From a paper:
We divided 18 fragments into two main groups based on the conformation of the enzyme to which they bind. Group 1 (fragments 1–5) bound GlcB structures retain a closed active site lid conformation, and Group 2 (fragments 6–18) induces an open lid conformation. In the other 13 fragment structures, this region, which we now refer to as the active site lid, undergoes a major conformational change. The Gly-459 backbone rotates ∼70° and moves 3 Å away from the Mg2+ ion, and the Phe-460 backbone moves 2.5 Å (measured at the carbonyl oxygen), and its side chain flips by 4 Å (measured at Cγ). The large conformational change of the active site lid ultimately creates a solvent-accessible portal that is ∼7 Å in diameter, distal to the CoA binding tunnel entrance, and very close to the Mg2+ ion as shown in Fig. 2. Although the Group 2 fragments also maintain their aromatic rings in the hydrophobic pocket, in contrast to Group 1, none of the 13 fragments of Group 2 coordinate Mg2+. Moreover, the majority of Group 2 have no direct interactions with the residues of the active site lid. Instead, ring substituents from this group hydrogen bond primarily with ordered water molecules that gained access through the opening and were not observed in the closed lid conformation of the enzyme. Seven of 13 fragments in Group 2 were separated into subgroup 2.1 as they all make a hydrogen bond with the backbone carbonyl of Met-631 (dN-O = 2.6–3.2 Å), resulting in a relatively high ΔTm ranging between 4.6 and 8.6 °C. Eight of 13 fragments in Group 2 (6–12) form hydrogen bonds with the backbone carbonyl of Met-631 through a nitrogen on a five-membered pyrrole moiety or a fused indole, thienopyrrole, or quinoxaline moiety (6, 7, and 9–12) (dN-O = 2.6–3.5 Å). Several fragment hits have nitrogen-containing groups such as pyrrole, indole, thienopyrrole in which the nitrogen interacts with the backbone carbonyl of Met-631.
GlcB generates malate and coenzyme A (CoA) from glyoxylate and acetyl coenzyme A (AcCoA) following the conversion of isocitrate to succinate and glyoxylate by ICL. Because of the essentiality of the glyoxylate shunt in infection and the absence of it in humans, both ICL and GlcB are attractive targets for drug discovery. The active site is an ∼20 Å-long tunnel located at the interface of the TIM barrel and a loop comprising residues 616–633 of domain II. A Mg2+ ion required for activity is bound at the bottom of the active site tunnel in an octahedral coordination by one oxygen each from the carboxylate side chains of Glu-434 and Asp-462, two water molecules, and two oxygens of glyoxylate.
Residue numbers in the entry: 2 to 71, 75 to 303, 312 to 727
């Protein structure tokens, strides 16, 4: 065929081989029984999966027709959504009962990294990013300005280094204050009677709160490092007077190390391009290596844990790696990794649950067959499930997980669930969605891109929508952000599960990140997404300056969003825009699509630093495609713009995207032979067919074009 027959299934040999030879050994699950369970799970769960997808289509069909007869009566609109089953009754108050959850999630607040699992070295970097140098972060980025004269160059600018040092000293004052004086005047550190004691030029002092002293290394009389704790996060003062930086430091300090990326999401969904059996296996194989703890790539090796000395005691170890979640794909797509007897593809999410769940077994244990490094410490498996619509699709995820756990021979509720709030039918039924996963949920979060794509698609027929930039401050999205935090805290998330907020996408603009991203913890988010290990470290500053626990209890019991605000469709007003503004918005959207699409389709890259139309480096996932294509399809549908406008724009934008990828040998230009670039045709189709797509999802077209490209590369 060539495939492996097991019941109604025809399994791609690469997958069959990978599973039996690499993933199964060490798990004590008998191969023939694993494959029987797979057959059974797929046979039993496929019908309901399909039933859900159909229900999505029926609802959207009803809304499309409703809008085609029309301001908007919100009373009648709201009651329509209730009649059809879109808006469901808000259940009574409850508290989640999820148990066996790691410390990283229950108690601590901090940055959360996301990385495409298909890139080993990015995945490895993310795992080791649990601890990072603040000096390197401050020195290498624009947090410390190049004026003056702190300009960066080949040589080490000693002027810049002093700025870094002073910056770090201040942070210490702010986060672990001394009873008198400041770290900036320190001459040394000693450990007397299980207390940190700091040497001043005048006298000496202790911590204003001695309980913030976590541990140390070396002799108590002359420590090689000091370990501090604040708001659950650790701070390490590396002390070494013989160091280059140390010789010039008043107290011999070499560096300050911050606990940064507390948890990481290894991503199988929107940051990766994976359209067939071969791609899935490359992804499963890295997930395997991460869980074994033996993954290593050729630039290297997962960092082992960090050992310290307790204040008045023996040794203790702290986790050196970021706690790994995995984002499986959602309920939509199928993949040829497995087909049935009639040749139709199996649902890709069901597959991920089985395989990523199986592979995750190796991370619950350290052995010669399971590999040396453990992930979860409380025996959990953390799966973020994206793009769910409403509480019934959450319950289906519960059931899927529950069924997988039987096949894997795991205790029930082993497989925990991160509910991404990124679709409108979830937003407005959020409390119900959490309720359906009440014994499994460990995470909710919000974002911009997917949610705004769905916003636009759901109300496609209602009229033209505001510009993408404008969306970020519209009533619905402000309500959506608050209503998430509120639903969460009301379900008892504080001290139990993460409340997360979106990615900082501008990877070179770190000064701005430090200035503004502090808004997310101030809004009571226990975690938020960062695009790099450097960003994780800088964002960790915010959890020191903000007591997320304190903020969360202050927000307790508040109902800051109304259903009316959630349901306020972002229609543009009359007149609204001038020609030049319209063209500018089209260009920006065609550049966004083209810029991301060309690397996805031509090179199978789903996450990278893509310069936007103003050459700013952005790190967005595939959901950039959905928001951009839906906005244009919306503008197209209501005659704000034409198909020829869109094509003229794609043709204008293409050569810029081309020259923006000049430093690439494997890059192939889209201009001037437009109609012969699979990437180009993919970008054009995403728009002109955008309105027909199920909920505006881009994967159907995208996967097919990537398949088409790989097929032409087979000759
Ligand atoms: O929501 C976003 O903008 C966003 C998500 C992800 C995942 C990555 Cl890996 S990079 C990235 N950006
Ligand atoms: Mg998304
Ligand atoms: Mg405090
Ligand atoms: Mg439709």
């Amino acid at each position: 065929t060539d495939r492996v027959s097991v019941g109604n299934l025809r399994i791609a040999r690469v997958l069959y081989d990978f599973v039996n030879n690499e993933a199964l050994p060490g798990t004590d699950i008998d191969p023939d029984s694993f494959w029987a369970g797979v057959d059974k799970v797929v046979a039993d769960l496929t019908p309901q999966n399909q039933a859900l997808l159909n229900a999505r289509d029926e609802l959207q069909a009803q809304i499309d027709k409703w809008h085609r007869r029309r301001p908007i009566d919100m009373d009648a609109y709201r009651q329509f959504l209730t009649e059809i089953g879109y808006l469901l009754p808000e259940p009574d108050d409850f508290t989640i009962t999820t148990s066996g959850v790691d410390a990283e999630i229950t108690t601590t607040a901090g940055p959360q990294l996301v990385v495409p699992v298909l890139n080993a070295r990015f995945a490895l970097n993310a795992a080791n990013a649990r601890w990072g140098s603040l000096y390197d972060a401050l020195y290498g980025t624009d947090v410390i300005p190049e004026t003056d004269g702190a300009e960066k160059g080949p040589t080490y600018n000693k002027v810049r280094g002093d700025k870094v040092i002073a910056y770090a000293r201040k942070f210490l004052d702010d986060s672990v204050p001394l009873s008198s004086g400041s770290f900036g005047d320190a001459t040394g550190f000693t450990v007397q009677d299980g207390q940190l004691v700091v040497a001043l030029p005048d006298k000496s002092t202790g911590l204003a709160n001695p309980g913030q002293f976590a541990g140390y290394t070396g002799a108590a009389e002359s420590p090689t490092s000091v370990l501090l704790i604040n708001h659950g996060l650790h701070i390490e003062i590396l002390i070494d007077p013989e160091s280059q930086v140390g010789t010039t430091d008043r107290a011999g300090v070499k560096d300050v190390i911050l606990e940064s990326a507390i948890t990481t999401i290894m991503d199988f969904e929107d940051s990766v391009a994976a359209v067939d059996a071969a791609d899935k296996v490359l992804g499963y194989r890295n997930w395997l290596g991460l869980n074994k703890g033996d993954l290593a790539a050729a630039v290297r090796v997962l960092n082992r844990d960090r050992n310290y000395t307790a204040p008045g005691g023996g040794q203790f170890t702290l986790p050196g790696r970021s706690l790994m979640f995995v984002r499986n794909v959602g309920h939509l797509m199928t993949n040829d990794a497995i087909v049935d007897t009639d040749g139709s593809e199996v649902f890709e999410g069901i597959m991920d649950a089985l395989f990523t769940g199986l592979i995750a077994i190796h991370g619950l244990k350290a052995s010669d067959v399971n590999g040396p490094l453990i992930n979860s410490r409380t025996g959990s498996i953390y799966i973020v499930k994206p793009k769910m619509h409403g509480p019934a699709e959450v319950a289906f995820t519960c059931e899927l997980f529950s069924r997988v756990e039987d096949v894997l021979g795991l205790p029930q509720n082993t497989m925990k669930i991160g509910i991404m709030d990124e679709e409108r039918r979830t937003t407005v039924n959020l409390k119900a969605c959490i309720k359906a996963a009440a014994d499994r949920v460990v995470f909710i979060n919000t974002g911009f891109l997917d949610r705004t794509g769905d916003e636009i698609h759901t109300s496609m027929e209602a009229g033209p929508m505001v510009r993408k930039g404008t969306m970020k401050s519209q009533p619905w999205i402000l309500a959506y952000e608050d209503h998430n935090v509120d639903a969460g805290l009301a379900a008892g998330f504080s001290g139990r599960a993460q409340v997360g907020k979106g990615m900082w996408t501008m990877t070179e603009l770190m000064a701005d990140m430090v200035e503004t991203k502090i808004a997310q913890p101030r809004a009571g988010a226990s975690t938020a997404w960062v695009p790099s290990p450097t960003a994780a470290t800088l964002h960790a500053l915010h959890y020191h300056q903000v007591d997320v626990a304190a903020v969360q209890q202050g927000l307790a019991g508040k109902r800051r969003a109304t259903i009316e605000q959630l349901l306020t469709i972002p229609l543009a007003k009359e007149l609204a825009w001038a020609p030049d503004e319209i063209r500018e918005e089209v260009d920006n959207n065609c550049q966004s699509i083209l810029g991301y699409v060309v690397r996805w389709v031509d090179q199978g890259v789903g996450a990278s630093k893509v310069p936007d139309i103003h050459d700013v480096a952005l790190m967005e996932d595939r959901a950039t495609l959905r928001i951009s294509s839906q906005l244009l399809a919306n503008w197209l549908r209501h005659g704000v713009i034409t198909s020829a406008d869109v094509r003229a724009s794609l043709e204008r934008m293409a050569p810029l995207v081309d020259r923006q990828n000049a430093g690439d040998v494997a890059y192939r230009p889209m201009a001037p032979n437009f109609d012969d670039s699979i990437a180009f045709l993919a970008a054009q189709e995403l728009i002109l067919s955008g309105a027909q797509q199920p909920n505006g999802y881009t994967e159907p077209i995208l996967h097919r074009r990537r398949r088409e490209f790989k097929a032409r590369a087979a000759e």
